[PDB]
Amino acid sequence: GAMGSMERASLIQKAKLAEQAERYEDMAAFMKGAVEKGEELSCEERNLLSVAYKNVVGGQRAAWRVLSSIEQKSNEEGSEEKGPEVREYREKVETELQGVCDTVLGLLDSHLIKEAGDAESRVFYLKMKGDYYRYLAEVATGDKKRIIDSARSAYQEAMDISKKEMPPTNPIRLGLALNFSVFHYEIANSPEEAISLAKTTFDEAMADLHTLSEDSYKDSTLIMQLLRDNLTLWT
């Protein structure tokens, strides 16, 4: 791997510099190198891994959505034939997106999840596995059912652990629930399930805010507001 000669600590340090420079593909490559050293990741390092790949895949998803919209308009009645180029370029972007998802899923399978024993690490990684299968599902049109079921399975395992091992205000638990609710609404065609999950999660967090410090309260309420924003859109 191109990062095999670089110290782990140097890869972490450069990931943080890349973040400051908004060089997210570099950040992801540094964090992939750090994972491939074989040691478990700290909380801070997990979050660098997630921020890096989320920014890379987010750019790809946005591009794919633009291209797919253009392609769909091209396939409307009375649209002029323009040749294979829009499909080809949408496919190019799609294939690159799938490649990034496969890279992340591969890091999780070899060997982040199997060595993660604490609830905070294991839930974090299982949520990531659900997220990247969800991004694969957004572009899938052929195995689609199996991709969807892989996302669902990862999210459900993360949910089961989080409900047993973490308080209802924990930010990783809250972000998991937020994302699993969007899976239900956008991917699984289950808007009622999405709404029920978001509601239950919000209400259970609200009842436990009284236990928190001012700083923890800020962290939890930020995610709660995201649940509220989706519930406003959906109801």
Binding site: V51, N55, G58, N179, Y185, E186, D229, L233
Partner: peptide, 7 residues
């Protein structure tokens, strides 16, 4: 719809 983290 909102999901966790940055875009």
């Amino acid at each position: 719809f909102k999901t966790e983290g940055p875009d």
